[PDB]
Design a protein around this ligand. Structure first.
Ligand SMILES: *Cc1c(COP(=O)(O)O)cnc(C)c1O
Ligand SMILES: *Cc1c(COP(=O)(O)O)cnc(C)c1O
Ligand SMILES: C[C@H](N)C(=O)CCCCCC(=O)O
Ligand SMILES: C[C@H](N)C(=O)CCCCCC(=O)O
Ligand SMILES: C[C@H](N)C(=O)CCCCCC(=O)O
Ligand SMILES: C[C@H](N)C(=O)CCCCCC(=O)O
Lengths: 748, 738
């Protein structure tokens, strides 16, 4: 729910290490900018230790008072400190009071106002006595501050004062722990502010500057310039070379070694460089805004969007996504004051999404490492770690006790297509062959490649308009569904209450009236049927229909008894989407072939996987290459996606890394506030609701999505079906905030 | 062509910065290892050394072990050699000088210490400056090569290779040290920073080694009472051990001999961690093939024919070369050229690969993956721009993202047919394509393929090839001249020359086509210039050019499938430049993304686009995978498109011409086509193919390649040095003589 503005440049001041000029750099910049109308410089120092002997914010205040007298250019100036620890406060003669977190709100302020003059505003948000890493100071002086509160506070300040330049001076190195222990570069990530890196002009500064630089990149920050103090080592050359001259490297003149030195003539001597640095920063912002302000119009002109009728998409609809931090997009809207705002990704970018901000950062690292170690290496007949590992994790988990082989493809569609080739051989070897057909459930869906399309029954997705070869190539049955209405779980079956959601999934029902009834209607219908293929539990693209699990269980046994290969398509259900790692756990039955993707890779990159039985495998063990399965894309098992998936499989499953993971460990905890779920099932305009795992869907008895968009919720519809989808790691607090927004809106 | 062994642990000693204990660390380790109560041997390499001879890390290790040896009272042979210095450095001892310099103190039978400084300079700054000041330089290869000699010369046993400076400090050549060592990908440990700011410094140094795909077995630093190890371990999720050495004596006069003893605990730990991590790495390698065969279902492979002995273990990749573990050749990693370009995806330099990695991490971190439809974000918008201004120059107006070639092709068909079934308002449709052409393994991409090893009933009942398939004239090099097969040329260029537009064959072609032209033909689809999966057949360009005009004249949509030809594979960015004609729809992948990750793209005409501009969503093209335009692939492709095209980043792009130069030895391509066993040869851009066990022989010459039955090819990246291709043809030619 953040909302920062871009009409005015706002920069982080980073530094490779300690004692490298960071605050001088801030001061030069502030100076070059102020000593030249209602021109205003806002200097934030959000974290400060060694207070009050050291106060970078005071220094900036001080040195500008001085530089102002030198240029003879009056200015208003102020230096405020908002919160300190108790010890820090005492150091200022202060019987101040401590909050539940150990901070004091100081009244401390230090204005020297000159009406109408260019204004300087310096602020230290949080201060500690001990001149040490904030993380230690916080525990020593029992004064802590949560990352959110820090960012939140910076946001208040930022908005309170929004020509204009804002500098936000970091504390310590790029990767130095903040008060909470969170490395500083991770703490600021949610805001993704551009910045400059104060480098190291000493011996070892090349290595130190490049590493610090690389570590900001690795977090997806942008660095407008690198600056350092000349120590006669000619450090800037290797720096520029490495930066391919794509980022300017400014070299400040040596600083006076005499501790008594004013620096006032050094600042003057360095005007050149500071002028440059300021322009580079001011510039880069304008250029960043120019591109943002043209991206929608250009998007509309150059893109061919999937599943979109362009005639209906207006530029004012086109969403500009500048970055993503876990569940939230950062979205540029110029119709504001040109501002970036968080907006929840509630379609999970087509059901691919899962990662924490935290996980996302970790994944990135793993990916860069994998890119660097393997990039992409030839799969067939070869082995390499990320792939071997991914396969092991897949078999010991989602394919536990049934799967023996893992076949890699690039996505769901390719996965499904391979499953068909697979199923049919198993069949046409079980019965030695004719003409084959799938059996599937109407409304089920399996990808948009022609083969994956054939196992789909006629739908908005099929026809003559999509594929003029689309026939509708199997035997399609209408499935009973299940859903939540006015506070109880119901059922809908072909013309031909449960006490709770679990009751439905229960084994109590294997001996019910309906198991027999189902068994009968199936056995009847069972132009040759070659394979069974289902979207276990949920019909996704179908409109988030929960299929009666018992129906599917029975159907699986029916085909299995008939020696028909069973294909589970868990591209959508797999890996925690529904609150379990496989739906194998919800149907009670196992398949012969299953397909995975979307969440397989934690929503970072596409990879897909098709698991097989020792038997389905064997049905291709011949003597000619011609009896092998000749399907395989160029990027088969690409190390990247493999390594990534390997990591997501583990992280999502582990109660340590994923805090939604429950005790038994086979299961997610409920994420969707029980109360609101009932509430929404009881709604006038709500026809039905389906809720399980990370999925909250409803059906209705362009408009409501509009309202949700204003509440910071991006989501995609399925015509009249409207859903909220989180990741395997989203906090129930967030889901609850999410249901609230949606409910209020329904009242419209 | 490198060949280093893993039966003995070999580690780089990295350090976050200068003055942090690096050489102490090396010394403790060496000590913990040699002062135990055999033919136990420690090889200490210091490949780069400045400040020589006042400073000699190699001498320090030599000295301190002499001392520690008397302290534990455990004799050892010891030696300290300096191989090359600069002239100034040499003079300081009464364009590199080679020195005799050696300093043995041999004790027969005792555990041996072997210290070596490979290259030394006298001044005390970054090697990169010392090299230009003392006019003594050394090329990265020569450095690595030298370390390899030493490594092999002396191959229980532990070898330490002590870096110079920071993780990211310039070597003599200017190459950051972490890049210089990449080709070897040796595991290592990172000596961290126990001082104020060491947390940030240690993490960034660490992340910069990871970003280069190195593995770090432990981090160690000297306690300065700041409790630095906690944030370190937290950050490392305790997955890497963080060893904390006790404070070092601040008195400059201190022996350190009692500190080293005091730190034995930590050094034993550190040595074990290192020794142990190698055994664990080897255990995994030594089981990977067997396990691969048990767990994998390999594409385009008959498992019954793949023996464990065949399974290749790939430990990493550095540009064009795999690092391959063979337990056979004395559990050793060896370079092996990726001459199938991992199914024609490959392109990147070692250099480019590193750059790409960074770009990808940044992209993963900035975007991971974000919803495409109706949205815009930079890597995607950028990629699209670069695509239209280049490969789709002056014809393409739309870019449609999919995940691979197959998905790309499938979308093209949906696209083509609507354009058609709106040009003629509709029936039943079928493609026209050339026999042997290929377009992916999804059923739709399969239909536009005529019967082949790839199609059938065994491969998919639903195949029927919904098309009209013509047998195409081909072209090829034989006994020193370009020929033709249809159902002699002066030079290869007389072939894509458009003066042949007015030849006898243009009208003959025009006629054979026009006949079959006017069961409805809905779209034209070709593999421009080359039939890839078909067996590397060069199709007569003129034939295709004509055929395009023929269909275009008939208002039939034209689909170029440049999934294989796109982006420099053939020495050009598109084949639009070789066919003279333009299409209505084109498909790209494989090299689109520099061979790093899969992405694919289908370009369209303003018109083909418009044929889907209705009022219902049901009218729109309802095709689109979950990862449509995934920021990663997009950002990556954007970068590869630029890098490959730019003479600055890609040195095969002629400075004057601005295009792939000629790569394959002209002399040797002739000798080959002129050879007995060699039936034909096709050679253009990055592709060298011939038609006719031999892959076995090539494997021994360090060349990994896939066949197409009897077709046998060598495929490099848009950036491979002709020197390498020449070395490549040589190997292949010699083998043919067998
Ligand atoms: C998304 C999906 C697919 C297809 O995966 P893509 O990567 O989108 O091709 C197949 N089946 C189901 C149930 C899906 O949800
Ligand atoms: C490789 C290839 C394809 C298919 O791409 P994948 O990513 O392998 O599915 C299509 N057409 C041609 C000519 C190709 O070479
Ligand atoms: C002289 C001695 N070998 C030494 O510590 C050299 C430092 C190397 C340069 C590291 C840098 O500036 O990044
Ligand atoms: C594999 C990928 N679809 C491709 O373009 C190549 C086609 C098949 C070649 C099979 C081989 O390597 O022998
Ligand atoms: C007191 C001074 N401001 C200071 O450098 C504190 C932070 C130290 C950096 C945290 C690290 O070790 O990485
Ligand atoms: C996008 C991916 N191929 C997938 O399976 C999702 C279903 C199709 C899109 C449904 C919609 O229009 O929102």
């Amino acid at each position: 729910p953040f909302h920062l503005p871009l009409n005015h440049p706002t920069y982080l001041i980073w530094s490779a290490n300690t004692s490298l000029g960071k605050t001088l750099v801030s001061t030069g910049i502030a100076a070059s900018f102020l000593l030249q109308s209602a021109t205003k410089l806002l200097y934030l120092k959000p974290i400060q230790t060694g207070f009050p002997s050291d106060s970078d914010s005071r220094f900036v205040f001080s040195k500008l008072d001085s530089l102002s007298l030198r240029r003879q250019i009056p200015i208003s100036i102020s230096n405020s400190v908002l919160h300190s620890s108790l010890p820090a406060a005492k150091s200022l003669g202060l019987n101040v009071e401590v909050s539940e977190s150990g901070m004091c709100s100081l009244n401390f302020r230090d204005e020297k106002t000159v009406t109408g003059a260019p204004e300087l505003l310096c602020k230290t948000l949080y201060a500690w006595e001990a001149a040490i890493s904030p993380h230690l100071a916080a525990e020593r002086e029992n004064a802590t501050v949560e990352d959110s509160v820090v960012l939140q506070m910076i946001e208040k300040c930022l908005k309170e004062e929004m020509d204009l330049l804002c500098l936000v001076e970091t504390a310590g190195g790029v990767a130095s722990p903040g008060p909470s222990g969170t490395l500083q570069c991770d703490l600021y990530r949610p805001f993704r502010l551009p910045g400059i890196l104060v480098g190291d002009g000493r011996l070892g500064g090349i290595s130190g500057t490049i590493a610090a630089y690389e570590s900001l990149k690795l977090r997806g920050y942008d660095i407008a310039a690198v600056v350092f103090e000349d120590h006669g080592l000619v450090n800037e050359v290797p720096l520029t070379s490495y930066l391919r001259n794509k980022v300017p490297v400014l070299v400040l003149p040596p600083v006076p070694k005499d501790p008594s030195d004013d620096l006032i003539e050094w600042f003057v001597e360095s005007d050149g460089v500071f002028k440059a640095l300021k322009e580079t920063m001011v510039l880069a912002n304008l250029e960043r805004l120019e591109r943002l302000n043209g991206m929608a119009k250009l998007a509309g002109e150059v893109f061919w969007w999937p599943f979109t009728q362009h005639k209906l998409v207006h530029q004012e609809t086109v969403t500009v996504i500048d970055s993503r931090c876990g569940e939230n997009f950062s979205i540029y809207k110029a119709s504001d004051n040109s501002s970036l705002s968080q907006q929840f990704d509630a379609c999970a970018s087509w059901w691919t999404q899962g990662p924490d901000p935290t996980f996302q950062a970790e994944l990135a690292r793993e990916m860069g490492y994998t890119a660097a170690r393997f990039g992409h290496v030839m799969f067939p007949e070869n082995v390499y770690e990320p792939a071997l590992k991914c396969a092991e994790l897949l078999l010991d988990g989602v394919g536990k006790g049934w799967a023996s082989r893992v076949y890699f493809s690039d996505n769901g569609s390719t996965a499904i297509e391979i499953a068909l080739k697979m199923a049919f051989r198993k069949f046409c070897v079980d019965h030695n062959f004719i003409v084959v057909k799938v059996i599937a459930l109407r409304g089920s869906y399996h990808g948009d490649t022609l083969g994956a399309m054939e196992a789909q029954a006629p739908s908005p997705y099929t026809g003559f308009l999509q594929q003029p070869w689309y026939t509708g190539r199997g035997l399609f049955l209408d499935p009973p569904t299940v859903f939540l209405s006015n506070g109880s779980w119901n059922i809908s079956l072909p013309e031909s209450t449960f006490t709770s959601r679990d009751e439905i999934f229960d084994k109590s029902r294997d001996a019910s009236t309906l198991a027999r009834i189902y068994s009968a209607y199936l056995s009847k219908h069972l132009a040759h049927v070659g394979a069974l293929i289902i979207e276990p539990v949920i019909h996704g693209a179908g409109g988030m229909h929960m299929v009666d699990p018992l129906f599917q269980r029975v159907l699986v046994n029916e085909c299995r008894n008939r020696k028909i290969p069973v294909i589970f398509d868990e591209v959508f259900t797999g890996f925690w989407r529904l609150g379990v790692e496989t739906t194998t756990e919800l149907l009670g039955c196992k398949p012969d072939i299953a397909c995975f993707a979307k969440l397989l890779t934690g929503g970072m990159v596409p990879l897909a996987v098709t698991l097989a039985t020792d038997a389905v495998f064997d049905s291709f063990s011949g003597d000619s290459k011609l009896k092998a399965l000749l399907h395989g894309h160029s990027y088969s098992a690409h190390a990247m996606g493999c390594a990534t998936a390997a990591k997501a499989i583990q992280w999502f499953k582990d109660p340590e890394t994923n805090h939604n993971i429950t005790s038994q460990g086979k299961t997610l905890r409920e994420l969707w506030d029980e109360e609101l779920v009932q509430q929404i099932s009881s709604h006038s305009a709500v026809q039905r609701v389906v809720v399980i795992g990370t999925l909250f869907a409803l059906e209705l008895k362009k408009s409501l999505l509009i309202m949700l968009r204003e509440d910071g919720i991006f989501t995609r519809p399925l015509g009249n079906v409207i859903y909220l989808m989180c990741g395997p790691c989203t906090s129930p607090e967030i889901c609850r905030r999410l249901l609230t927004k949606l409910y209020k809106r329904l009242g419209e």
